[PDB]
């Protein structure tokens, strides 16, 4: 909230970019994303599997399991992996907004450097 912070004292501090220390926003965004994505459907699962070109020969359980584990493991001590986080988030939103699914490689690289 604001009872323990301040806009004029928490807008920027040139903080470093560590990969071992967990961030409230990291676990918060990942938790929420996994909770909302946990209700994935055949349509969503298929959409993602198609965009990422992943093997959709499995089942809804396999797809949801892969994504869930990806985001869940994306925040592991000494094994950070935000790539899957942004990728999954984009996929979910895209399907939730009915947006086009561009190249997984191109898009990923764009969000990576961007």
Structural key phrases:
114 residues, mainly alpha, 5 helices, 0% strand, ligase, SUMO ligase
Short description:
Helices cover 56% and strands 0% of the residues. It has 114 residues and is an all-alpha fold.
End-to-end span in angstroms? 29 Å
List the domain count as a whole number.
1
Profile the largest sheet.
none
Order of helices and strands: HHHHH
Q: What is Rg?
A: 16 Å
β-strand percent reads under 5%
Family: Belongs to the PIAS family.
Subunit structure: Interacts with UBC9 and CDC3.
Organism: Saccharomyces cerevisiae (strain ATCC 204508 / S288c)
Subcellular location: Cytoplasm; Nucleus; Bud neck
Account of the 3D structure:
With 114 residues, the chain is an all-alpha fold. It has one domain. Helices cover 56% and strands 0% of the residues. The chain has 5 helices and no strands. Helix 1 runs antiparallel to helix 3 and helix 2 packs across helix 4 (82-97). The two termini are 29 Å apart. It is classed as ligase. The entry lists the keywords SUMO ligase, DNA binding, sumoylation, Metal-binding, Nucleus, Phosphoprotein, Ubl conjugation pathway, Zinc-finger, ligase. The assembly is monomeric. The entry is titled "Solution Structure of the N-terminal SAP Domain of SUMO E3 Ligases from Saccharomyces cerevisiae".
């Amino acid at each position: 909230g604001s009872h323990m912070i301040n806009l004029e004292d928490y807008w920027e501090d040139e903080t470093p970019g560590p990969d071992r220390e967990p961030t409230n926003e990291l676990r918060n965004e990942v938790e929420e994303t996994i909770t909302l994505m946990e209700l994935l459907k055949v349509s969503e699962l298929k959409d993602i599997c198609r965009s990422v070109s992943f093997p959709v020969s499995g089942r809804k359980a396999v797809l949801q399991d892969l994504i869930r584990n990806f985001l869940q493991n994306a925040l592991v001590v000494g094994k950070s992996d935000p790539y899957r986080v942004q990728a999954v988030k984009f996929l979910i939103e895209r399907i939730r907004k009915n947006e086009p699914l561009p190249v997984y490689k191109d898009l990923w690289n764009a969000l990576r450097k961007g």
